[PDB]
Coordinates of C-alpha atoms (C1' of nucleotides) in Angstrom, one line a residue:
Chain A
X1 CA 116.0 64.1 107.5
X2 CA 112.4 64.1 107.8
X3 CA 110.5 65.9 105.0
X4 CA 107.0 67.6 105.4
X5 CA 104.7 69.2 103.3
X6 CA 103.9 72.7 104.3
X7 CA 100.8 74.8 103.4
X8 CA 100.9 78.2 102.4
X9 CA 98.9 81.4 103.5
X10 CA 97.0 83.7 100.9
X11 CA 100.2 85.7 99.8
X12 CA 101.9 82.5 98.8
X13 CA 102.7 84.1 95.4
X14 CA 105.7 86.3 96.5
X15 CA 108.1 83.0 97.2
X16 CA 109.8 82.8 93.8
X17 CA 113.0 80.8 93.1
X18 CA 116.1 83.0 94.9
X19 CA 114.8 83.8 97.4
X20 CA 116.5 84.6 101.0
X21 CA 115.8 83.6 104.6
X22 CA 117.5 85.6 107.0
X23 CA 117.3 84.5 110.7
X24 CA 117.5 86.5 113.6
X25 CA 117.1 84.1 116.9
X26 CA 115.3 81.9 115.6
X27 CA 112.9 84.1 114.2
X28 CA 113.2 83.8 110.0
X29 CA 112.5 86.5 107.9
X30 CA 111.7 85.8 104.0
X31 CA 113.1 88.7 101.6
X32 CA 113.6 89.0 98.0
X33 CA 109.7 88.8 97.2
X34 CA 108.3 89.1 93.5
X35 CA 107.7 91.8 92.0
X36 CA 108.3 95.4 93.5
X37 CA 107.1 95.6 97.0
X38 CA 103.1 96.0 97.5
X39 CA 101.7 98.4 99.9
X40 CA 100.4 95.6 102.1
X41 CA 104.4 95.6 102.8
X42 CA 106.3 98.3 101.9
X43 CA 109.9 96.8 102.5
X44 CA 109.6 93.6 101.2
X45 CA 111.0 92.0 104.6
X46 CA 108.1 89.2 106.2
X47 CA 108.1 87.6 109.4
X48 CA 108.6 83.7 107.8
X49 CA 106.0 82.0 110.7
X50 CA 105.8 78.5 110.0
X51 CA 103.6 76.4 112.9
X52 CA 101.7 73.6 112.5
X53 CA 103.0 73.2 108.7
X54 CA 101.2 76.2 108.3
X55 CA 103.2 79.4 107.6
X56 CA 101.9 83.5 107.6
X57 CA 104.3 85.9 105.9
X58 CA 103.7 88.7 108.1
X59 CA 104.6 92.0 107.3
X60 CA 107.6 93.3 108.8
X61 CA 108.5 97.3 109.3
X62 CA 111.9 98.6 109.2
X63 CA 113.3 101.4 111.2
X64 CA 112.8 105.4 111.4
X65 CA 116.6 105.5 109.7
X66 CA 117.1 102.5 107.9
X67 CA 117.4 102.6 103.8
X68 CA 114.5 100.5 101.9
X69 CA 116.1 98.1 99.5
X70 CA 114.8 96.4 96.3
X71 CA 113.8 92.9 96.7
X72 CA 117.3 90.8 94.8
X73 CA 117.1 87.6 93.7
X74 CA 120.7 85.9 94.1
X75 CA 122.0 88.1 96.8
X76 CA 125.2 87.1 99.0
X77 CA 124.5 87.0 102.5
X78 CA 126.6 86.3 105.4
X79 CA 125.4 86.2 108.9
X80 CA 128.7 88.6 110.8
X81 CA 127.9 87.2 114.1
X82 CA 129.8 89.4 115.6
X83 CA 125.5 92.6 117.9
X84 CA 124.1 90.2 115.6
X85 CA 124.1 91.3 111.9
X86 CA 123.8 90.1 108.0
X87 CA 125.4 91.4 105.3
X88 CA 123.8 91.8 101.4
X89 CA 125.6 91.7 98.3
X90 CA 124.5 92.1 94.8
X91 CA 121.8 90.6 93.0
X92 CA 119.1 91.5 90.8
X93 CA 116.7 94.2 91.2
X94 CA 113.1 93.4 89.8
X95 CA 113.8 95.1 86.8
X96 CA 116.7 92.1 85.6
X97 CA 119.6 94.7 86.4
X98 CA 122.0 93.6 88.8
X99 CA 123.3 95.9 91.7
X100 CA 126.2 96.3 94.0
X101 CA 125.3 98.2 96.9
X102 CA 125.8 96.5 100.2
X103 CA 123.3 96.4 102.6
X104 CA 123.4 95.7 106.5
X105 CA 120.2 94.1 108.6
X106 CA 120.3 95.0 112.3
X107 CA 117.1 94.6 114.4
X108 CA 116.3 98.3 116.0
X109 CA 113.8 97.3 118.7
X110 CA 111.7 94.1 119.1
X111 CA 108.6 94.0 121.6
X112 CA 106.8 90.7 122.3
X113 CA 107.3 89.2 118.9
X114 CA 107.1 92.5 116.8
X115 CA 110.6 93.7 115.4
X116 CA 111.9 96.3 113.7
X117 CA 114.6 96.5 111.6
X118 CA 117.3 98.5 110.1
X119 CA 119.0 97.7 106.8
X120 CA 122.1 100.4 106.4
X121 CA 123.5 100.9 102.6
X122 CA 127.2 100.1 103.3
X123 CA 129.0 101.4 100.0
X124 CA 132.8 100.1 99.1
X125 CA 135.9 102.0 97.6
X126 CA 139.0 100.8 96.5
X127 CA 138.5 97.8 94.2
X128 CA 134.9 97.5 94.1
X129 CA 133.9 94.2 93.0
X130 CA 131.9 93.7 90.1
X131 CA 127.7 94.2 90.3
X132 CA 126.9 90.6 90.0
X133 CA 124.8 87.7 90.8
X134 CA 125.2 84.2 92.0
X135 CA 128.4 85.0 94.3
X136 CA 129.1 83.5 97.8
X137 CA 130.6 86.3 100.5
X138 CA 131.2 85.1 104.3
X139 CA 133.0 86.7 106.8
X140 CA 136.1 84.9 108.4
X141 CA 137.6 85.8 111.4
X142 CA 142.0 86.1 112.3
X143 CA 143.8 87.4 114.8
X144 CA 140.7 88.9 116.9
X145 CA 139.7 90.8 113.3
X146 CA 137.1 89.7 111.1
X147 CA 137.0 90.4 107.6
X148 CA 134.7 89.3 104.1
X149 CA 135.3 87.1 101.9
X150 CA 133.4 87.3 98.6
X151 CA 134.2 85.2 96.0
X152 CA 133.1 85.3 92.4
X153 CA 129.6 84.8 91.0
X154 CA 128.2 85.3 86.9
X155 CA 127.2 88.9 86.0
X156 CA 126.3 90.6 83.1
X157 CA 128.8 91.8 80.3
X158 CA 130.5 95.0 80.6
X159 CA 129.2 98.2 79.0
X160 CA 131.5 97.5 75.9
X161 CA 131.2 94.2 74.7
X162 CA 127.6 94.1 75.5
X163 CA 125.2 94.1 72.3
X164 CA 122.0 94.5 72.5
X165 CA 121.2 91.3 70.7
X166 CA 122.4 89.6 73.7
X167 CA 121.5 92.1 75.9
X168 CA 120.8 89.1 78.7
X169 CA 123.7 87.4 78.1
X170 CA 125.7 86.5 81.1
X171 CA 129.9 85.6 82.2
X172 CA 131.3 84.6 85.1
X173 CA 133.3 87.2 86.6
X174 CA 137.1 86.6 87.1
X175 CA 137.8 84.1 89.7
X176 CA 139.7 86.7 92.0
X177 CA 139.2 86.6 95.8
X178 CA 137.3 90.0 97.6
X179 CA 138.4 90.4 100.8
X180 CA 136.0 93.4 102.7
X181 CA 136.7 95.4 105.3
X182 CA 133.5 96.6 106.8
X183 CA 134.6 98.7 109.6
X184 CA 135.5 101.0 106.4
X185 CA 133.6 99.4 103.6
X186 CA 137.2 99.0 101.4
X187 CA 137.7 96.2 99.2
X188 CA 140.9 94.6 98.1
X189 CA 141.1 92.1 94.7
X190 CA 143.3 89.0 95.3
X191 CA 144.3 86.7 92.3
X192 CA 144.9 83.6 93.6
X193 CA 146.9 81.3 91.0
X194 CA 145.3 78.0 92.1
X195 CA 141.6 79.4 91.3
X196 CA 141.3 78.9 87.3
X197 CA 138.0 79.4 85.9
X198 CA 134.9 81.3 87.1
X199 CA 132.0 79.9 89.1
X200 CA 129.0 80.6 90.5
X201 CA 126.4 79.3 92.7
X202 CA 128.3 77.2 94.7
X203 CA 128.4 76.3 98.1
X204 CA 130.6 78.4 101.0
X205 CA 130.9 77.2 104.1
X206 CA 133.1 79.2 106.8
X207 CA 135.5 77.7 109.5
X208 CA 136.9 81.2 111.7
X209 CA 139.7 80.9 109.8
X210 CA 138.9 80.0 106.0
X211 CA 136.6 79.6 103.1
X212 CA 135.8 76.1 102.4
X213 CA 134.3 76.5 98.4
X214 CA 132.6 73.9 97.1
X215 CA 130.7 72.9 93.9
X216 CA 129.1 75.1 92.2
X217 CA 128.4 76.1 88.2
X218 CA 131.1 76.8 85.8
X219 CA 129.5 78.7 82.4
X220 CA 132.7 79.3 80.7
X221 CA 132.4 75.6 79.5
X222 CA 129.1 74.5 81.0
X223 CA 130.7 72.0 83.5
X224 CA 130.6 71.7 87.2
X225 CA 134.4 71.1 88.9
X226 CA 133.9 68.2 91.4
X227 CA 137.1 69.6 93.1
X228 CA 136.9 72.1 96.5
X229 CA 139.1 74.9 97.7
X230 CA 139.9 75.8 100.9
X231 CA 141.0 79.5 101.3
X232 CA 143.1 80.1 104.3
X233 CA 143.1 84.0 105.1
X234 CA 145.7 85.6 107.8
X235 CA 145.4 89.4 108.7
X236 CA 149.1 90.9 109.7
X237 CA 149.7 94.1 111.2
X238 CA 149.6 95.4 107.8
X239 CA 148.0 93.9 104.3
X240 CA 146.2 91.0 104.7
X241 CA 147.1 87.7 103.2
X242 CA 145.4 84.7 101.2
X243 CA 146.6 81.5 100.2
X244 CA 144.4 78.3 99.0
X245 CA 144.7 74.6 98.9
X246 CA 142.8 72.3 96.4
X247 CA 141.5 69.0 98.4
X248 CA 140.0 65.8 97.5
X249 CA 135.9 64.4 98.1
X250 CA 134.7 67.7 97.0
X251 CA 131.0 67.1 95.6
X252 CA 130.0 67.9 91.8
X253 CA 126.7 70.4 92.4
X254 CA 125.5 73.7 92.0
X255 CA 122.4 75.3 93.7
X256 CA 122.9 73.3 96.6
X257 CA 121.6 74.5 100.1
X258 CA 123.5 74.6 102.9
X259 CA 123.1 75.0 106.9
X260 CA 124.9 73.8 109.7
X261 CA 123.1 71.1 111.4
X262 CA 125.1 70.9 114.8
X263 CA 128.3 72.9 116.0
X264 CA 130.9 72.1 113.1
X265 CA 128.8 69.9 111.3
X266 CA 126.9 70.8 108.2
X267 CA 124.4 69.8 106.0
X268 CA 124.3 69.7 102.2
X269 CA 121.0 68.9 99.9
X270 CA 120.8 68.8 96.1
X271 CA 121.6 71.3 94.0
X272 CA 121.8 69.7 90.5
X273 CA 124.4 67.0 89.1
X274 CA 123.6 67.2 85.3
X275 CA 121.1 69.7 83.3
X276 CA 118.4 66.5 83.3
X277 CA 119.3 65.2 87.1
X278 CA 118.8 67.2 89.8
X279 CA 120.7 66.0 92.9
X280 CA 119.0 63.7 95.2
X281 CA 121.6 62.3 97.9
X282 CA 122.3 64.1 100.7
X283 CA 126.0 65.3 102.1
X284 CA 127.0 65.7 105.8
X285 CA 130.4 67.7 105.8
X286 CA 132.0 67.2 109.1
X287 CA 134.4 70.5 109.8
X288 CA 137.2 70.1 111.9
X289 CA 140.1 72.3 113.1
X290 CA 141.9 72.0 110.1
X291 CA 140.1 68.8 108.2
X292 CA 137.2 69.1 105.9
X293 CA 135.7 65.5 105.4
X294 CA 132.6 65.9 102.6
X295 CA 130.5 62.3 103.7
X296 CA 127.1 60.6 102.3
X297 CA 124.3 60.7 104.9
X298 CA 120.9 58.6 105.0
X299 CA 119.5 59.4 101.4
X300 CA 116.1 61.4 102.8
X301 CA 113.1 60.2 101.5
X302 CA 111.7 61.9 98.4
X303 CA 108.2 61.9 97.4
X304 CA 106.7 61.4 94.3
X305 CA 106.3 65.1 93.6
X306 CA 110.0 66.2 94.2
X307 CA 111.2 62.5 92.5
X308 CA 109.0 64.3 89.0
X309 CA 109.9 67.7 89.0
X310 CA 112.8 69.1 87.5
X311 CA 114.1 72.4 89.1
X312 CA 113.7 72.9 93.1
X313 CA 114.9 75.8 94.8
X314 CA 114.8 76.7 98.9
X315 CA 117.4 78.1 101.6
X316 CA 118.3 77.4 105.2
X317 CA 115.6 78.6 108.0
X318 CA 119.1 78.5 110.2
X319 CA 118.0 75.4 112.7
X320 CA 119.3 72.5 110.8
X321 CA 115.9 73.3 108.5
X322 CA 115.9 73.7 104.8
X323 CA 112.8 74.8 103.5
X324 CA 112.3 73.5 99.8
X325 CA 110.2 74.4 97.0
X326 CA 108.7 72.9 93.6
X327 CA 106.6 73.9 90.5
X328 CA 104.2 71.6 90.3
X329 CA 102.1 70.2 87.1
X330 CA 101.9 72.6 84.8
X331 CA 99.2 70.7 82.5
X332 CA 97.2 69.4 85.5
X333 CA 93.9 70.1 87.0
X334 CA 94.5 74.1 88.0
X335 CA 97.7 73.2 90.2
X336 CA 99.4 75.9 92.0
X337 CA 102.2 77.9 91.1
X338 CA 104.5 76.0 94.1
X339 CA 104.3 73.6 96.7
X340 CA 106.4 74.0 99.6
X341 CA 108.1 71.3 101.6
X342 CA 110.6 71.3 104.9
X343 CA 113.1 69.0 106.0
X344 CA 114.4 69.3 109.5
X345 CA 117.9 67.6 109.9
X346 CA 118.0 67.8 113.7
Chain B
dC1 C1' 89.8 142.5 16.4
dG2 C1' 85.7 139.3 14.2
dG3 C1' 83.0 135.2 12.2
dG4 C1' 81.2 130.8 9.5
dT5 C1' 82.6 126.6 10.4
dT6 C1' 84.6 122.6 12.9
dT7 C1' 85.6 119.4 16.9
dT8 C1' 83.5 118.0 20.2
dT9 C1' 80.3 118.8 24.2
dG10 C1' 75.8 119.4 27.7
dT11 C1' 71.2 118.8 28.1
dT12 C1' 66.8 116.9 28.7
dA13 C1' 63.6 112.4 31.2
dA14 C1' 61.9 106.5 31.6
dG15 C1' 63.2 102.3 32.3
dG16 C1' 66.2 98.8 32.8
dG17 C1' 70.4 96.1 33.5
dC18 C1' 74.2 96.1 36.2
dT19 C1' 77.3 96.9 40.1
dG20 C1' 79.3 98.5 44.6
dT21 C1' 78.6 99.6 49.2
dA22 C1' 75.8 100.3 53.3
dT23 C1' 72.7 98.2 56.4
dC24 C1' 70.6 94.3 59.2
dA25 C1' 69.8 90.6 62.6
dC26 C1' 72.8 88.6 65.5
dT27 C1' 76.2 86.2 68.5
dG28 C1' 79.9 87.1 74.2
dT29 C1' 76.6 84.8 78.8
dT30 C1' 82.3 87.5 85.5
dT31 C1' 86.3 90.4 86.5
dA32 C1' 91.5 89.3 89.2
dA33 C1' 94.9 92.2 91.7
dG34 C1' 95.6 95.5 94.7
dA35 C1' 94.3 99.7 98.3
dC36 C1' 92.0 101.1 102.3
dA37 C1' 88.5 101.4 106.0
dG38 C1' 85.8 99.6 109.5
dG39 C1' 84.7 96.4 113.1
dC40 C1' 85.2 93.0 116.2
dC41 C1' 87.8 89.8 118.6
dA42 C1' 91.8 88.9 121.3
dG43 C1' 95.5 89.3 123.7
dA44 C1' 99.0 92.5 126.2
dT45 C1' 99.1 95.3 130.0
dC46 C1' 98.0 98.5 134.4

DNA sequence: CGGGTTTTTGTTAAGGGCTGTATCACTGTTTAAGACAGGCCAGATC
């Protein structure tokens, strides 16, 4: 919990809000720039160098057989630990249509702080989830197999009931349960009774044997269910299978940032509570071996610009580091697009 | 097909009163974003 203003380099305009920060030891990337990528970087992928509160968004090439994807803006990405590797899901394409391609990020060959990467187009079969936005997927591990779980985020409407009118117009999906196989890249749809109403940009942490879900929007009725699930997956020989329990203390947010601060221990910073008060307190959620315990931790220090501004956006650097973001004054003397902040949690 | 007639028409040029449209003098008082190529430092390496 110590905040810190950070100062940007000349190409500070590609940082929009939804944007990703993948981390491969300890080395961030930033993805999901604005706008289709330049030819200063043709992939879109940047080295995300912060030192002395100064960062460089260095471009970063990819591989001699790696696929080039489109720089999304709500993606769902899981880090499968497991020859480290992340794992992209959905979003939306600079041209506002969503997608549904998965995408794998390796690292090729590195030499003294020059990498290389290689993002693989994973496609699915079976039951294909839905192209959408928003969504949370993490891989959870049982009985020495590991396996996705993607859970459901808004999308657009469906090539029938979609007018042109409302051509922008967006539901939440159906709250069903995606579990992925990626050995194979097959999907399997799971209706759990005890998951109600649709939800999306929540807050997913994994425990090696579940889906702890958490928060999060609700657009069917514009609310935000305070309540938590926690999704315990077992893999037989055979078909998989899922059950979920509904638990007290869980938080009332959406957009909130997550990233775990020491082993079993994470963080959680605001999201928003109401449509006029974006969240301010800070949430320690102490994991366990069976146990989830959602706690209040020491209320970090705001300054006056993030205590003014109403939307603020940002993701994990993957050190117990969120790295924030704000608009800044709109009608004020020539102020930038964004300011940047980043609070270490230790 | 004529052919005296109408019944209306076509024309001249000066000067003026009027009207409709073209012409005139004139005013702005540097770019911002992105692509590529040197060139020189600056560090990695034999």
């Amino acid at each position: 919990m110590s905040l810190q203003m950070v100062t940007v380099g000349h190409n500070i305009a590609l940082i929009q809000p939804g944007f990703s920060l993948m981390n491969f030891d300890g080395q961030v990337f930033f993805f999901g720039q604005k706008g289709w990528p330049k030819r200063s970087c043709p992939t879109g992928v940047f080295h995300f160098d912060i030192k002395q509160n100064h960062l460089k968004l260095k471009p970063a090439i990819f591989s001699k057989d790696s696929c080039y994807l489109p720089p999304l803006r709500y993606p769902a990405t899981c880090s499968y630990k497991g020859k480290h590797q992340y794992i992209i899901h959905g979003g939306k394409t600079p041209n506002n249509e969503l997608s549904d391609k998965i995408y794998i990020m390796s690292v090729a060959c590195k030499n003294n702080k020059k990498v290389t990467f290689r993002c693989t187009e994973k496609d699915l079969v079976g039951d294909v989830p839905e192209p959408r936005y928003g969504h949370s997927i993490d891989v959870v591990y049982s009985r020495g197999k590991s396996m996705g779980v993607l859970f459901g985020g808004r999308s657009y409407m469906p090539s029938t009931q979609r007018t042109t009118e409302k051509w922008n117009s967006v539901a939440d999906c159906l709250p069903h349960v995606f579990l992925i196989d990626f050995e194979f890249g097959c999907a399997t749809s799971y209706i759990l009774p005890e998951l109600q109403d649709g939800l999306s940009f929540h807050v997913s942490i994994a425990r090696n044997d579940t889906v702890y879900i958490l928060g999060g929007h609700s657009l069917a009725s514009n609310i935000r269910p305070a309540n938590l699930y926690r999704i315990r997956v077992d893999l037989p020989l055979g078909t998989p299978a899922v059950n979920c329990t509904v638990l007290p203390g869980g938080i009332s947010v959406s957009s909130a940032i997550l990233t775990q601060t020491n082993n079993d221990e994470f963080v959680i910073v605001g999201g928003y509570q109401l449509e006029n008060q974006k969240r301010m307190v800070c949430s320690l959620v102490s994991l366990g071996d069976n146990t989830i315990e959602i706690s209040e931790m020491e209320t970090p220090d705001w300054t006056s610009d993030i205590k003014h501004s109403k939307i603020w956006f940002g993701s994990n650097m993957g050190n117990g580091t969120i790295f924030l973001g704000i608009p800044g004054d709109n009608k004020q003397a020539m102020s930038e697009a964004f300011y940047f902040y980043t609070l270490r949690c230790s």
